[PDB]
Amino acid sequence: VNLKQAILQAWKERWSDYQWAINMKKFFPKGATWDILNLADALLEQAMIGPSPNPLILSYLKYAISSQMVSYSSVLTAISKFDDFSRDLCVQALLDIMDMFCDRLSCHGKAEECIGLCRAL
Amino acid sequence: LSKMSSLLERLHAKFWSETIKLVRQVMEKQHLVSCLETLQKALKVTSLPAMTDRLESIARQNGLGSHLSASGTECYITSDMFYVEVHHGENPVSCPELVQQLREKNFDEFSKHLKGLVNLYNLPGDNKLKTKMYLALQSLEQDLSKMAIMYWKATNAGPLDKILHGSVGYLTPRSGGHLMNLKYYVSPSDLLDDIILHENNVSRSLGMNASVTIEGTSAVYKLPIAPLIMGSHPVDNKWTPSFNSVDLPACFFLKFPQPIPVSRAFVQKLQNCTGIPLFETQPTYAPLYELITQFELSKDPDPIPLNHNMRFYAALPGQQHCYFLNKDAPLPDGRSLQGTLVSKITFQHPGRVPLILNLIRHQVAYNTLIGSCVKRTILKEDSPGLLQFEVCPLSESRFSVSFQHPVNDSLVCVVMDVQDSTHVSCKLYKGLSDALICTDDFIAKVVQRCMSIPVTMRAIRRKAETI
Amino acid sequence: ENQVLELLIHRDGEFQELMKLALNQGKIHHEMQVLEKEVEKRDSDIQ
């Protein structure tokens, strides 16, 4: 259920967004709510490799954002950690992704998760 | 099955002089006989009257006025051409080619040659403007001959620099049915057959040609009847101002035997170079991936389509490649690399040809590089190997191939940008946690020596595996 | 009609092949007769 190992197999054959989501669950029996795994962070690492970020990783990130069970804080921290301003394509893609899910910032869960969201913000 | 019925009818009727008498009586007082003669022409016993009939039938299909003066010497006469075998001037030149077909049983090529001479005058002119129009044509081949002479004066190198990277292209001046053609490209794959020496005795189909000649056009244009080039720079060519000249309703066209897939930016830089619009009406723009695949699948005819489904397979002595062209890739401009097909080029003065042919050379080089992945080979669902490769364009004359690291697990991208006809630069993008694979100059040299993506991928794989 | 015009040509293209067939057996006739000569003299020789 390793992140790189599963992402490579997903990438080799063109898969729809829902099929990859269905498949990921099948790959690892204990999901652990995507916390130890840092799935949002892992996608970014694949995305920044190419000079132009591939649209399929961005679509996977969009789908992960769509589900309420993926916290917005982890995505924000992963985006902030990268920086390094190599080229305009990556910053434009990150700008579009950030523009997509902002202005709501709704968090459901325990209070310490809200505290972590404040620090991530 | 009609043979039995014919035999039965003949047996019925077999139960002459009377027929001859009836025909004689009719004689004393169309196309079917010509059709019978031309159908019997192919097997005619070799003799002088038989060849006379063959030539008269050939003229009948070609529409030439069939007039004979003797059994051995014949004259082809039409509006403005006159050729004798044993108008508006004498015979151009006693070229040995036409004698070569005539002396042997090569009359089909002779008929095509006659049709080509006729097609030289498919003009709507009034037999005086047409005359003048062909006179101008002479001026144009003189000007291109002077261009080639100047470029030969520039450097005493081989014809390879004349064809690939040079002004205009290699000359084959008009002689008989073969028009004056210009050689601008030969691919390294096409260059080597089964190492081909490139001495002066080069064939006309060895690669692709670019003919220049005149066809009537809907517009009226100012063209020089007299030769335009009289003074020559040491190494340049300068065109003297026109007007002699007069508003002649025709244009100079560069004809390509087959269409080339060209991007949109190539089209607008073409009107930037020339100024005359290429297309009368706006055509439908499509990504040039399907266009190039259909174009270079025609270099190997097959009546049965391959059903590739944009999943192309390549067979190598040690590797097997599975290719995904990945059409409709997201460019920064928001669209994809849209492209169309070009077959004809319009131009006004002989000073436009070098830039037009240079841009054509660049586009052909880029198209061949992209289409090297295109193959008819199928090695389906082979579990060992079967490396996955994805092609994604980035900008005009730019693209990139992204693929899994041959040893490691991260992705690796190799980006190609074509500078000139034989100039291509290469860059590498790799992850932070990775090892050395290759150098950009090595990839550029491999591209310049082969101009083929699968071969470059093989070289990179071998060099990374040796490390 | 035109179906018979080819039919003459179809018959035309075969007797010329058959014409040399008769000529080929002409040289053949000389070969067969000579062999008998020694057959008969041999028969007398053994008789």
Swiss-Prot record, chain A:
Entry superkingdom = Eukaryota
Question: What is the tissue specificity?
Answer: Ubiquitous. Abundant in skeletal muscle, heart and placenta.
> Where in the cell is the protein located?
Nucleus
Describe its assembly: Component of the Mediator complex, which is composed of MED1, MED4, MED6, MED7, MED8, MED9, MED10, MED11, MED12, MED13, MED13L, MED14, MED15, MED16, MED17, MED18, MED19, MED20, MED21, MED22, MED23, MED24, MED25, MED26, MED27, MED29, MED30, MED31, CCNC, CDK8 and CDC2L6/CDK11. The MED12, MED13, CCNC and CDK8 subunits form a distinct module termed the CDK8 module. Mediator containing the CDK8 module is less active than Mediator lacking this module in supporting transcriptional activation.
Physiological role = Component of the Mediator complex, a coactivator involved in the regulated transcription of nearly all RNA polymerase II-dependent genes. Mediator functions as a bridge to convey information from gene-specific regulatory proteins to the basal RNA polymerase II transcription machinery. Mediator is recruited to promoters by direct interactions with regulatory proteins and serves as a scaffold for the assembly of a functional preinitiation complex with RNA polymerase II and the general transcription factors.
Family that this chain belongs to: Belongs to the Mediator complex subunit 24 family.
The name under which this protein is listed is Mediator of RNA polymerase II transcription subunit 24
> Which source organism does the UniProt entry give?
Homo sapiens (Human)
Its ancestry begins with:
Eukaryota, Metazoa, Chordata, Craniata, Vertebrata
UniProtKB/Swiss-Prot annotation, chain B:
Per the record, which residues fall in region Interaction with the Mediator complex? 82-172, 175-339
Point out the coiled-coil segments of this chain. none
- Positions of the region Interaction with the Mediator complex and THRA? 1-467
Q: Which family does it belong to?
A: Belongs to the Mediator complex subunit 1 family.
Q: How does it assemble?
A: Component of the Mediator complex, which is composed of MED1, MED4, MED6, MED7, MED8, MED9, MED10, MED11, MED12, MED13, MED13L, MED14, MED15, MED16, MED17, MED18, MED19, MED20, MED21, MED22, MED23, MED24, MED25, MED26, MED27, MED29, MED30, MED31, CCNC, CDK8 and CDC2L6/CDK11. The MED12, MED13, CCNC and CDK8 subunits form a distinct module termed the CDK8 module. Mediator containing the CDK8 module is less active than Mediator lacking this module in supporting transcriptional activation.
Enumerate the subcellular locations listed in this protein's record, separating them with semicolons: Nucleus
Q: In which tissues is it expressed?
A: Ubiquitously expressed.
Q: What is the purpose of this protein?
A: Component of the Mediator complex, a coactivator involved in the regulated transcription of nearly all RNA polymerase II-dependent genes. Mediator functions as a bridge to convey information from gene-specific regulatory proteins to the basal RNA polymerase II transcription machinery. Mediator is recruited to promoters by direct interactions with regulatory proteins and serves as a scaffold for the assembly of a functional preinitiation complex with RNA polymerase II and the general transcription factors.
| Residue numbers spanned by region Interaction with ESR1 | 4-467
**What does the entry's PTM section describe?**
Phosphorylated by MAPK1 or MAPK3 during G2/M phase which may enhance protein stability and promote entry into the nucleolus. Phosphorylation increases its interaction with PSIP1.
Give the shown range, full length included. Answer: 13 to 518 of 1581
Q: Which domain of life is it from?
A: Eukaryota
State the name under which the record lists this protein.
Mediator of RNA polymerase II transcription subunit 1
Swiss-Prot record, chain C:
Localization, UniProt: Nucleus
Q: Which domain of life is it from?
A: Eukaryota
Family classification: Belongs to the Mediator complex subunit 4 family.
What function does this protein fulfil? Component of the Mediator complex, a coactivator involved in the regulated transcription of nearly all RNA polymerase II-dependent genes. Mediator functions as a bridge to convey information from gene-specific regulatory proteins to the basal RNA polymerase II transcription machinery. Mediator is recruited to promoters by direct interactions with regulatory proteins and serves as a scaffold for the assembly of a functional preinitiation complex with RNA polymerase II and the general transcription factors.
Task: Describe, as the record does, how this protein assembles with itself and its partners.
Answer: Component of the Mediator complex, which is composed of MED1, MED4, MED6, MED7, MED8, MED9, MED10, MED11, MED12, MED13, MED13L, MED14, MED15, MED16, MED17, MED18, MED19, MED20, MED21, MED22, MED23, MED24, MED25, MED26, MED27, MED29, MED30, MED31, CCNC, CDK8 and CDC2L6/CDK11. The MED12, MED13, CCNC and CDK8 subunits form a distinct module termed the CDK8 module. Mediator containing the CDK8 module is less active than Mediator lacking this module in supporting transcriptional activation.
User: Any idea what this protein is called?
Assistant: Mediator of RNA polymerase II transcription subunit 4
Species of origin reads Homo sapiens
Question: Which span of the entire protein is present here?
Answer: 62 to 108 of 270
